[PDB]
Paper text:
Unlike the wide variety of HCPs, the CTD homologs (CTDH) fall only into two clades, of which only one is present in Anabaena (a clade 2 CTDH). Recently, it was revealed that isolated CTD of Synechocystis OCP and CTDHs from Anabaena and Thermosynechococcus elongatus (a clade 1 CTDH) are also capable of carotenoid binding. Both CTD and CTDH were shown to mediate carotenoid transfer to apo-OCP, apo-NTD, or apo-HCP (from clade 4).
Crystals were obtained in the presence of urea. The asymmetric unit dimer (hence called A-type or back-to-back) was formed via an interaction plane between the β-sheets of two monomers, quite distant from Cys103. PISA suggested that only the F-type dimer has biological significance, (ΔiGP value of 0.067 for the F-type dimer interface). The presence of the disulfide bond forces the formation of the F-type dimer of apo-AnaCTDH. The most striking difference between the apo-AnaCTDH structure presented here and the CTD-OCPO structure is a major shift in the position of the C-terminal tail. In contrast, in the apo-AnaCTDH structure, the C-terminal tail adopts an internal position, coming closer to the F-type interface between the CTDH monomers (CTD-NTD interface in OCP), partially covering the opening of the designated carotenoid-accommodating cavity in the apo-AnaCTDH structure. Owing to the steric constraints, the F-type crystallographic apo-AnaCTDH dimer is not capable of performing carotenoid uptake from the membranes, as the carotenoid channel is partially blocked by the C-terminal tail and filled with the Cys103-containing loop (hereafter β5/β6 loop), while in the A-type dimer, the carotenoid cavity is open. Thus the F-type dimer cannot accommodate the carotenoid unless structural changes occur.
Author numbering: 15 to 138
The structure:
């Protein structure tokens, strides 16, 4: 769970991610949902998304600490979550920005790294 956030979709995003259930994580997105990761351009659809997560977020532990949520006037739920994404040898501070549709699918996710020198030695 995350401080300030009780939205089930977001809890599952991080739950499944930390179990290596990458296609389950990716299932949370609408079929044309987009992930915007730190170093590449956008990735479209659960398959490209699940590929990305499995062959990148390998060996990573996402550590969501706190979050905010809003409803925009078009009925979408906006959820911002801050935390860390660590490994054993290095980590990074992270802002996760989610937007959900009325059906609770992820329409898009942006992952922003809050920059440092360890981040500059990324594989990407």
């Amino acid at each position: 769970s995350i401080a300030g956030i009780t939205e089930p979709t977001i809890l599952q995003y991080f739950a499944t991610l930390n179990a290596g259930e990458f296609a389950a994580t990716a299932a949370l997105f609408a079929v044309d949902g987009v992930m915007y990761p730190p170093f590449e351009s956008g990735i479209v659809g659960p398959d490209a998304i699940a590929a990305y997560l499995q062959q990148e977020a390998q060996g990573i532990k996402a550590e969501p600490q706190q979050g905010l949520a809003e409803t925009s006037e078009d009925g979408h739920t906006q959820v911002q979550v801050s935390g860390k994404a660590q490994t054993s040898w290095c980590g990074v501070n992270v802002l996760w920005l989610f937007t959900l549709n009325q059906e609770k699918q992820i329409i898009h996710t942006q992952i922003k790294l809050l920059a440092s020198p360890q981040e500059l030695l990324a594989l990407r």
